[PDB]
Design an enzyme around this catalytic site. Structure first.
Site, PDB file in Angstrom:
ATOM      1  N   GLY A 143       0.745  -1.257   0.036  1.00 50.71           N
ATOM      2  CA  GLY A 143      -0.118  -0.020  -0.045  1.00 50.71           C
ATOM      3  C   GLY A 143       0.913   1.283   0.028  1.00 50.71           C
ATOM      4  O   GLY A 143       0.464   2.121  -0.868  1.00 50.71           O
ATOM      5  N   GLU A 253      22.913   7.631 -21.276  1.00 53.52           N
ATOM      6  CA  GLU A 253      23.142   6.960 -22.615  1.00 53.52           C
ATOM      7  C   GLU A 253      22.198   5.735 -22.645  1.00 53.52           C
ATOM      8  O   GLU A 253      21.859   5.081 -23.554  1.00 53.52           O
ATOM      9  CB  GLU A 253      24.774   6.375 -22.937  1.00 53.52           C
ATOM     10  CG  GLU A 253      25.682   7.600 -23.069  1.00 53.52           C
ATOM     11  CD  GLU A 253      27.130   7.158 -23.813  1.00 53.52           C
ATOM     12  OE1 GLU A 253      26.755   6.348 -24.675  1.00 53.52           O
ATOM     13  OE2 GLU A 253      28.097   8.173 -23.676  1.00 53.52           O
TER      14      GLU A 253
HETATM   15  N1  LIG Z   1      12.950  -9.034  -2.798  1.00 51.98           N
HETATM   16  C1  LIG Z   1      12.078  -8.458  -1.654  1.00 51.98           C
HETATM   17  N2  LIG Z   1      10.782  -8.578  -1.773  1.00 51.98           N
HETATM   18  C2  LIG Z   1      10.141  -8.271  -0.704  1.00 51.98           C
HETATM   19  C3  LIG Z   1      10.864  -8.044   0.540  1.00 51.98           C
HETATM   20  N3  LIG Z   1       9.830  -7.867   1.444  1.00 51.98           N
HETATM   21  C4  LIG Z   1       8.548  -7.645   0.792  1.00 51.98           C
HETATM   22  N4  LIG Z   1       8.782  -7.924  -0.583  1.00 51.98           N
HETATM   23  C5  LIG Z   1       7.758  -8.095  -1.583  1.00 51.98           C
HETATM   24  O1  LIG Z   1       7.175  -6.907  -1.684  1.00 51.98           O
HETATM   25  C6  LIG Z   1       5.569  -7.186  -1.740  1.00 51.98           C
HETATM   26  C7  LIG Z   1       5.181  -6.546  -0.414  1.00 51.98           C
HETATM   27  O2  LIG Z   1       5.353  -5.358  -0.345  1.00 51.98           O
HETATM   28  P1  LIG Z   1       5.840  -4.422   0.824  1.00 51.98           P
HETATM   29  O3  LIG Z   1       7.116  -3.872   0.908  1.00 51.98           O
HETATM   30  O4  LIG Z   1       5.717  -5.356   2.088  1.00 51.98           O
HETATM   31  O5  LIG Z   1       4.604  -3.363   1.276  1.00 51.98           O
HETATM   32  P2  LIG Z   1       5.097  -2.162   2.005  1.00 51.98           P
HETATM   33  O6  LIG Z   1       6.000  -1.091   1.345  1.00 51.98           O
HETATM   34  O7  LIG Z   1       5.499  -2.377   3.406  1.00 51.98           O
HETATM   35  O8  LIG Z   1       3.395  -1.443   2.253  1.00 51.98           O
HETATM   36  P3  LIG Z   1       2.559  -1.632   3.571  1.00 51.98           P
HETATM   37  O9  LIG Z   1       2.334  -2.943   3.982  1.00 51.98           O
HETATM   38  O10 LIG Z   1       1.562  -0.640   3.246  1.00 51.98           O
HETATM   39  O11 LIG Z   1       3.637  -1.079   4.569  1.00 51.98           O
HETATM   40  C8  LIG Z   1       5.548  -8.643  -1.955  1.00 51.98           C
HETATM   41  O12 LIG Z   1       5.711  -8.831  -3.139  1.00 51.98           O
HETATM   42  C9  LIG Z   1       6.578  -9.390  -1.243  1.00 51.98           C
HETATM   43  O13 LIG Z   1       6.974 -10.454  -1.687  1.00 51.98           O
HETATM   44  C10 LIG Z   1      12.257  -8.231   0.760  1.00 51.98           C
HETATM   45  O14 LIG Z   1      12.899  -7.907   1.847  1.00 51.98           O
HETATM   46  N5  LIG Z   1      12.970  -8.477  -0.518  1.00 51.98           N
END
Ligand SMILES: Nc1nc2c(ncn2[C@@H]2O[C@H](COP(=O)(O)OP(=O)(O)OP(=O)(O)O)[C@@H](O)[C@H]2O)c(=O)[nH]1
Ligand SMILES: Nc1nc2c(ncn2[C@@H]2O[C@H](COP(=O)(O)OP(=O)(O)O)[C@@H](O)[C@H]2O)c(=O)[nH]1
Ligand SMILES: Nc1nc2c(ncn2[C@@H]2O[C@H](COP(=O)(O)OP(=O)(O)O)[C@@H](O)[C@H]2O)c(=O)[nH]1
Ligand SMILES: [Mg+2]
Lengths: 442, 430, 49, 298, 430
Positions: A143, A253
């Site tokens: 979100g 570039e």
């Molecule tokens: N590569 C990677 N993907 C992540 C990680 N943590 C969460 N994700 C992915 O990102 C998505 C979840 O987004 P979040 O970063 O948890 O969302 P947010 O920014 O915390 O937003 P809020 O829940 O409203 O606080 C999912 O697709 C997860 O698989 C991480 O540490 N590394």
């Protein structure tokens, strides 16, 4: 020379920890900001300037802000090992999350926090003399990442204008999923991201899990492995600005060579010598082997098969001990292959870069140490298949208004769903039309 | 982000005493209120449930209400009873008489102003307020009537916060009271408008958990209240410790409820292991996922196999891989695909937290929104209608002052809730 | 350099082995606690009789 | 039947249990020395500890009240019945089961000198995984009932396990005990006092004018008034202990607790060594005389 | 490649207890469950039969089922009984009554769901599942009825895996029960449909092995169950150790069964010899083959000299030359050519495994598909037809609910199996 990084939300802050760990170990700055050097002459080493600025006492501090709506992750950064590197003002935290609602980030809560963010970016831009872009890391599934990322990119795009904004984006995987509402947030994110980003790199967690199972020998990977891999890719792309080389490539570039039309700015990323230390002593790593590696679909960091599309442009970054004649021989051999096809309007399909600094090895890392590596980013029509499956999942949920009452209650008109879905449909039609051979229309 | 707890009636106060023992143990708070923990990680979020008294002391953010002081004197005499602030104990001078109308109309309006005064005094001290947590039984007298009264007042006064309830509902077989159907029907009527999310537990299901899974020879209410305190403290665990994928009560509500009336959930907790078979099985993600969905481990009499899952949530505590969680939830959804509602492409949310409950390597708590919950309400409605046609005990309630029209309204509203669950239960691809 | 990389990997392996031994000890402890509870119940019943 | 080593153990128990030179033992000694906590059925949790006393009375009282005590032969045939009943036991092995059940029930072996507490692991071995984190208890012998009655005073969770009990003098090893070692003997609990989380030093003497100490093992919440005079004499605040001339400190080690560690701590691992090596490499490249991998800055 | 064992009824539980003793000894597993072996070759295939529980321990992948707990309490009391996982013991509260119909229809359908739940939980834990192995008697009550019921359910749920059975069948000479023919006939009817490969043993043959070969003065069921555990552990031995010419249960089935109904086999095991005689004769490949083919050493009452070999298989254990094996099998086929079916050019498959059973330099196990097995079924059918014409005990079975038409179907199906074997025997062609 210098670039400023903006990290938003959970994925962006956690990926930021891996990025700054790598950039510190590669330049040699201590965790407290020091930089030991025993020779009194030969201090003329400006390479840190791309990412750090020094105070009058000689401490180094990095050009980054960390943005999150929940406090826990940034408070973990405040109490960790790198406490003294960052100025406490850079670690920005709100009171409550956007609860996986794009509407809460965009309409109700991000409007209060956005002006502090713009003031911080101004405070960074005042300590600059040649800014040539912003690097942004976020996931479109959550979100606050979706809502505040869109709002912040809109405000940055009005205030700074022509300055480049490069995004590294984690899209919701085609069958791995973590939350039910991912399609709505990803569609609404992509609508804003189309207008307000100069280059967008696409990543899927399912691809990095497959790559870490097949090439590395890790049975139970975790996000730290994926984030360390992403940090290595970003270090490879920004290495062209920081170290000597035969053919340098400035960040402008990439945008001039990879983007044919202003809407066609989504690129795929891959990395060649992902190999374990035990495998590393069994193989030579010549230019042609790693050049063949970046084109295999087993190497991609997004779940799409480029054999189902046509390449429009390729950008090949070589770093380490490589000689230009070998790069030319490799690219000519790739061009001979029959499973690689270019659109007939793109005869000169490749851009090359050659840098002498080999990739750094991180003490806790899982990659082997290698004398040379190649990294590839390419624009291809196969990505249209990635959007169609998200559109099908959105249509499936929206046909019964499965969760819309949260979004409409928190302040958004129902019309906004149909507008965004039709705009992404037009992007799909753009990718269908651009890929049609001109010899067929005569 | 602080929660305020309310404990109502005998069942609520008894469950609360065990809950605050479990929470004080997990954060290392002595029954004198002094911190005795062994890591800074315990102290840094203590504010979530405790208020700070001057130099060291901690006080638990809870209001205790009951109509006869017997229970409060029992909790004050208990081993942790001293921790509670004396001004937070609210009691009357005559009992509920196991009658909903007394609890709602006669002793309710007499006491209710003092509970709202105490909750506002407690609420306004917080710097930012997260939801309330309420424990009560629906079959009792003061618990049902005054609990739902207080819930309605708090929903008037704090409509932007979260309202969370844990509720015990009468088994059809272990009848401790004759007039259970009236109190249950009126309470469910109050809950479907006022509550944001309500969890339901059958005491019969806790007995079946104890006897079949733990094989206890002589269970007591301390064990049932320990199971409840375990799930209650598990739902909030991500609020108050770090983790790889944080989650929150509001994020659970947003992901679980497709439409606002469908907010009643089942609970379970997985790593329950028998007293003589612990050396034989190591903790692992397959073991937790397999136990977590086994109906032996679910805290309601309805079984999922007679319904379909709309949504589910799993909160994992411990250092573990995300790959194992995502691939387990995908494999379970794919292999049993007929039991998952088809117009949602992925029904399960996962969350991961670093800090397990003391003495377990790993644990998961499961929240499920399943249409088989309609079977409990239908059973209560059958028992209510059978007695009401002949007016079996109605003169007590009518003598207190209730119009007979209330019973037909409450019956109609419960029947409509059952119908709404039933339509989504029996849909098919056509 | 890859030699030293392998050495650090070996050290990490030893550390996780130690953690596994810790967890096994904890499981045995919890079994002992359950046995003590059963002992107390039987004592109370005998006193009654 | 019983092996000769078991006969030697029975003889040792009888002789150590026998006061005076008379070949008779009072039944009160039988009651006081017998350990119910090591009874197999009680340890597995299927028999009440008070049921053992009735069994002891049933086997022994008929001759105890007649001859004024128990001789060696009745004790030996009691153990013969013990072996006969253990022959049909559920355990995979029989000889070791009989041997260690005799050792457990009759409280023989090596015990920590004050308060007579049976150690869980050898005292000279450093603490293993779990016991390096679980807090220990402070215990001393009661005086109104003489030593040998197995009644002690206990204060719970006031000692860190960061040290090894093998370094202490033999007359102070039993002052600190684990919770699992208190089973089978009477305990009297004492109340703590309100204080912050501070750690306090333990000192003692081994020769006139020479002192030895162990740093920071006692919590500052031990209430000194309840302890006896000598025990609170040996406990002293840290810097005052430091100021004492000619003091030696016992080596202490702190171990990580795997119940309270996060996932983000994995990032900054082994980085100071790598950054030191990188700084050395870059200054060597700057000075010249680098022929392989060289730094390529500006 | 994981095997699942099922032990059913009294005979099954006793044979299983001795089998898991022999296998645990061969892999050096202490009766406490700790690995104490002395070569990596022992450790590297432990997964085939054991799952790993936490801190060292291994647990054997077996389900124990019986209708009255007397036997189960006896096996738990045995010397290795502790190793078994408590949850893997399934028992009821009233006996089979030595009645097939009770075991199949009344207590079978009552208990079977908990066994299928345990078998599925255990099967789905394997990373790749190889066939099932089934042990039961046909003459009993719960063994025949519930064993064949469970076999039918497992064939519905896992039709692509292997189903293997070892089965004990009554005798005309030393019967323990009068109603043996009904239970045997109905069980053979169920087995011929459900099973993939079935081995049959007569207790009379084990007595003749014990008395004649080992010269025991007073044999007991422990010796018979040791002979059975030896052959059972021998058939799977090449699956789980290296060798010069590997073999597998599926490769044995593919080479032995020419047509799918012809899947009933005879067994023998060669290095049997009395403690007095053992000083007089060294091990060699001619000695093993000569003992292996001597009809004195075969575990059925039917004699091969009255039938013909369709196919045969020999599995050799030990470090040995391939030359001796191939030339011995050629010499035996050429010299006795009238006893081998002529439309197959070579009837014997050989396999060689490096690791012998402890304390023997070499061993071979023999599996033979011979038409003389038809003589046993004909004899049982004779006694059944003698008993059935007079309705001798039929009211028990009819009172459970069976239609008399089942008996005529089962008789016809067994008679057709006997006819098919007799047709393939057809001494000569024309
Ligand atoms: N590569 C990677 N993907 C992540 C990680 N943590 C969460 N994700 C992915 O990102 C998505 C979840 O987004 P979040 O970063 O948890 O969302 P947010 O920014 O915390 O937003 P809020 O829940 O409203 O606080 C999912 O697709 C997860 O698989 C991480 O540490 N590394
Ligand atoms: N699980 C559980 N149930 C309880 C407990 N105490 C009472 N009950 C049940 O709750 C019902 C009685 O309601 P009660 O709490 O006395 O209503 P009140 O008089 O208004 O407080 C009966 O079904 C009891 O079995 C308890 O401690 N735990
Ligand atoms: N070879 C052998 N036969 C057995 C054993 N135990 C019982 N039997 C035979 O099996 C038949 C009895 O079947 P049983 O196992 O009691 O059936 P159940 O009651 O259903 O378990 C009789 O012919 C017994 O002689 C055994 O350990 N070995
Ligand atoms: Mg978030």
């Amino acid at each position: 020379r210098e670039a400023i990084c903006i990290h938003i939300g959970q994925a962006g802050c956690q990926v930021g920890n891996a990025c700054w760990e790598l950039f510190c170990l590669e330049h040699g700055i201590q965790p407290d900001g020091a930089m030991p050097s025993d020779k009194t002459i030969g201090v003329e080493d400006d390479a840190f300037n791309t990412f750090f600025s020094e105070t009058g006492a000689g401490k180094h501090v990095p050009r980054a802000v960390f943005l999150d709506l929940e406090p826990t992750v940034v408070d973990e950064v405040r109490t960790g090992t790198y406490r003294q590197l960052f100025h406490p003002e850079q670690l920005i935290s709100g009171k409550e999350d956007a609860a996986n609602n794009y509407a809460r980030g965009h309409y109700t809560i991000g409007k209060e926090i956005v002006d502090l963010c713009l003031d911080r970016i101004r405070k960074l831009a005042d300590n600059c003399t040649g800014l040539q872009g912003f690097l942004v890391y976020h996931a479109v599934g959550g979100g606050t990442g979706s809502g505040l990322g869109a709002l912040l990119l809109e405000r940055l795009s009005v205030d700074y204008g022509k300055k480049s904004k490069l995004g590294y984006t984690v899209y919701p995987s085609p069958q791995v999923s973590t939350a039910v509402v991912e399609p709505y947030n990803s569609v609404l994110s992509t609508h804003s991201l189309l207008e307000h980003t100069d280059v967008a790199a696409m990543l899927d967690n399912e691809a990095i899990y497959d790559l870490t199972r097949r090439n590395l020998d890790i049975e139970r990977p975790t996000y730290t492995n994926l984030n360390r891999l992403i940090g290595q890719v970003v270090s490879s792309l920004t290495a062209s600005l920081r170290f000597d080389g035969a053919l340098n490539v400035d960040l402008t570039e990439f945008q001039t060579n990879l983007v044919p039309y202003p809407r066609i700015h989504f690129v795929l990323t891959s990395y060649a010598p992902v190999i374990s230390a035990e495998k590393a002593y069994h193989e030579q790593l010549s230019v042609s082997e790693i050049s063949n590696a970046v084109f295999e679909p087993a190497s991609m960091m997004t779940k799409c098969d480029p054999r189902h599309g046509k390449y429009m442009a390729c950008c090949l970054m070589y770093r380490g001990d490589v000689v230009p004649k070998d790069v030319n021989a490799a690219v000519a051999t790739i061009k001979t292959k029959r499973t690689i096809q270019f659109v007939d309007w793109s005869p000169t399909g490749f851009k090359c870069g050659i840098n002498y600094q080999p990739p750094t090895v991180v003490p806790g890392g899982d990659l082997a140490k290698v004398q040379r590596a190649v990294c590839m980013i390419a624009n291809s029509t196969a990505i249209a298949e990635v959007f169609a499956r998200i559109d099908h999942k959105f249509d499936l949920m929206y046909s019964k208004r499965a969760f819309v009452h949260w979004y409409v209650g928190e302040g958004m008109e129902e019309g906004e769903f149909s507008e965004a879905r039709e705009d992404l449909a037009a992007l799909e039609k753009d990718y269908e039309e651009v890929g049609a051979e001109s010899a067929d229309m005569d | 982000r602080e929660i305020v707890c309310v404990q109502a009636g005998q069942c609520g106060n008894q469950i609360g005493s065990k809950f605050w023992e479990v929470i004080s143990d997990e954060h290392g708070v002595d029954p004198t209120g002094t911190y005795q923990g062994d890591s800074d990680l315990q102290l840094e979020r203590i504010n979530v449930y405790f208020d700070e008294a001057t130099g060291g002391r901690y006080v638990p953010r809870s209001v205790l209400i009951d109509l006869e002081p017997g229970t409060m004197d029992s909790v004050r005499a208990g081993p942790y009873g001293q921790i509670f602030r004396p001004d937070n104990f609210i009691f009357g001078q005559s009992g509920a008489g196991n009658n909903w109308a007394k609890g709602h109309y006669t002793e309710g309006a007499e006491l209710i102003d003092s509970v709202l005064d105490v909750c506002c005094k407690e609420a306004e001290s917080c710097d930012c307020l997260q939801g309330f947590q309420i424990c009560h039984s629906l079959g009792g007298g003061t618990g049902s009537g005054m609990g739902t009264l207080l819930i309605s007042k708090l929903r008037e006064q704090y409509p932007d916060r979260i309202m969370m309830t844990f509720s015990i509902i009468p088994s059809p077989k272990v009848s401790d009271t004759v007039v259970e159907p009236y109190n249950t029907t009126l309470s469910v009527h109050q809950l479907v408008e006022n509550s944001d999310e309500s969890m339901c537990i059958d005491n019969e299901a806790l007995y079946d958990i104890c006897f079949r899974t733990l094989k206890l020879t002589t269970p007591t209410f301390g064990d049932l209240n320990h199971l409840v305190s375990a799930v209650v403290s598990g739902v909030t665990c991500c609020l108050r410790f770090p983790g790889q994928l944080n989650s929150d009560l509001r994020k659970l509500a947003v992901n679980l409820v497709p439409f606002p009336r469908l907010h009643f959930f089942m609970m379970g907790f997985a790593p329950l292991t028998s007293r003589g078979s612990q050396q034989y099985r190591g903790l692992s993600v397959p073991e937790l996922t397999q136990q977590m969905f086994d109906a032996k481990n679910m805290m309601q009499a309805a079984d999922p196999r007679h319904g379909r899952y709309l949504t589910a949530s799993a909160l994992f505590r411990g250092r573990m891989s995300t790959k194992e969680v995502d691939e387990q939830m995908l494999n379970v959804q794919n292999k049993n695909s007929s039991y998952f509602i088809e117009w949602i492409p992925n029904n399960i949310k996962s969350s991961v937290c670093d800090i397990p409950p003391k003495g377990l390597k790993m644990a998961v708590t499961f929240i499920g929104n399943n249409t088989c919950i309609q079977e409990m309400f239908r059973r209560v409605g059958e028992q209510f209608t059978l007695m009401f046609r002949r007016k079996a005990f109605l003169h007590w309630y009518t003598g207190e002052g209730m119009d007979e029209m209330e019973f037909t309204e409450a019956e109609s509203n419960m029947n409509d809730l059952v119908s709404e669950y039933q339509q989504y239960q029996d849909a098919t691809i056509e | 350099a890859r030699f030293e990389q392998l050495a650090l990997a070996e050290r990490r392996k030893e550390e996780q082995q130690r953690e596994e031994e810790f967890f096994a000890q904890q499981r045995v402890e919890e079994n002992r606690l359950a046995n003590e509870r059963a002992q107390k119940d039987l004592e109370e019943d005998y006193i009654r009789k | 039947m019983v092996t000769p080593e078991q006969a030697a153990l029975i003889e040792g128990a009888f002789r150590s249990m026998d006061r005076d030179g008379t070949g008779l033992v009072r039944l009160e000694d039988i009651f006081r020395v017998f350990d119910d906590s090591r009874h197999p059925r009680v340890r597995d949790g299927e028999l009440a500890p008070a049921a053992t006393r009735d069994m002891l009375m049933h086997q022994f009282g008929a001759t105890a009240q007649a001859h004024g005590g128990v001789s060696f032969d009745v004790f030996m045939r009691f153990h013969e019945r013990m072996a006969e009943d253990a022959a049909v036991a559920k355990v995979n092995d029989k000889e070791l089961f009989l041997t260690d059940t005799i050792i457990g029930v009759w409280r023989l072996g090596t015990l920590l000198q004050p308060t007579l507490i049976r150690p869980l692991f050898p005292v000279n071995v450093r603490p293993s995984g779990l016991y390096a984190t679980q807090y220990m208890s402070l215990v001393w012998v009661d005086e109104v009932a003489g030593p040998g009655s197995f009644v002690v005073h206990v204060v719970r969770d006031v000692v860190r396990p960061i040290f090894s009990r093998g370094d202490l003098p033999p007359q102070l090893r039993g002052m600190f005990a684990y919770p699992t070692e208190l089973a089978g003997m009477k305990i009297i609990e004492e109340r703590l006092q309100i204080a912050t989380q501070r750690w306090l030093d333990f000192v003692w003497e081994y020769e006139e004018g020479k002192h030895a100490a162990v740093p920071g093992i006692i919590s500052a919440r031990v209430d000194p008034d309840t302890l006896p005079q000598y025990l609170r004499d040996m406990i002293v605040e840290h810097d005052v202990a430091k100021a004492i001339p000619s003091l030696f400190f016992v080596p202490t080690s702190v171990a990580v607790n795997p119940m309270y560690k996060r996932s983000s701590e994995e990032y900054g691992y082994g980085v100071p060594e790598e950054v030191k090596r990188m700084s050395r490499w870059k200054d060597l490249t700057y000075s010249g005389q680098a022929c392989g991998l060289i730094y390529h800055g500006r």
